[PDB]
Amino acid sequence: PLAYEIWMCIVFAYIGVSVVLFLVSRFSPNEFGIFNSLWFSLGAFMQQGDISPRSLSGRIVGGVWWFFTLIIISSYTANLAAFLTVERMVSPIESAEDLAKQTEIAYGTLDSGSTKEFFRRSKIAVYEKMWSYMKSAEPSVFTKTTADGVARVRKSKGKFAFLLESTMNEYIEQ
């Protein structure tokens, strides 16, 4: 949900702020150790936390790093919520009006037959828009054979669709 590259920068800023803590805590105790500074940097990195400093400089370094990572993990929470909101979006195609409502996934029929004569001699404006799309496609969406359309759909991964009879579709489904 965030990235696979911002995390390394987060770890680099984490270890840099731990270097800052081990510097300034030993530059003016409780945070004298490198594990103490790294542990307080870990506690400042998360929400909760242990050993409270008393200095001006250490507390202001904690206040810089701590609201920073607060906004970061809050943004992680909101971003994961947005991705799961995406996860339950629009149902798949179930009608011809669903085909008319979209333009990302293309579709085609056979180059000849009464199937093409149905769309060519149609009167319903939805199917008229379908025949307008199929007659003005760039390039031509028509295949010569049925298996050519099957291979065109199978090499699409959700980009091209095909229209056919229901019995033939249920047989090729099985």
Partner: protein, 169 residues
């Protein structure tokens, strides 16, 4: 004693060498219109073999300022200059240690140079807007070694300060 100082010196030398290698070439990789490598000044495609300076700064004012920072590598070149100055200060403080107070300023300058290197890495990552090159990983590892060498240097400094406070009493 001297072994930790020599380890800090060779760590600073290896960090400066990896920083020079990060300045040099192969910093990032991006498939252009085939793959191509870049070193923040020029691009080299995978005709084939030629290289050209693809660091074009033109095509609110914050976007133009960020583009001006990302152009010509203002942060990492000055960071490498500060690392070289800190290495020269550490080499000057290694022999004939007269005053025991310049080592803290040298360590502070070294940590600030590492922080500016991390800021320049953040700028170079933000200027990317698909994989990464070797010199970005080398600069990251040099940042790790520079942080460890800074921790070792300030540990030797607080040990020397504790020795001076024990000998003064």
């Amino acid at each position: 004693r001297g072994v930790q100082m020599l380890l800090t010196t060779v760590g600073a030398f290896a960090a400066f060498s990896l920083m020079t290698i990060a300045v040099g070439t192969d910093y990032w990789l991006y498939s252009r219109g085939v793959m191509t490598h870049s070193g923040l000044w020029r691009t080299c495609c995978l005709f084939k073999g030629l290289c050209k300076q693809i660091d074009h700064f033109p095509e609110d004012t914050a976007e133009y300022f960020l583009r001006a920072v990302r152009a010509s590598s203002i942060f990492p070149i000055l960071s490498v200059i500060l690392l070289f100055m800190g290495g020269l200060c550490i080499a000057a403080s290694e022999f004939y240690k007269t005053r025991h107070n310049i080592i803290l300023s040298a360590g502070i300058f070294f940590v600030s140079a590492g922080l500016s290197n991390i800021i320049g890495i953040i700028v170079y990552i933000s200027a990317n807007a698909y994989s990464y090159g070797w010199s970005f990983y080398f600069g990251a590892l040099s940042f790790i070694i520079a942080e460890m060498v800074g921790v070792l240097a300030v540990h030797m400094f607080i040990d020397r300060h504790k020795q001076l406070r024990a000998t003064a009493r």
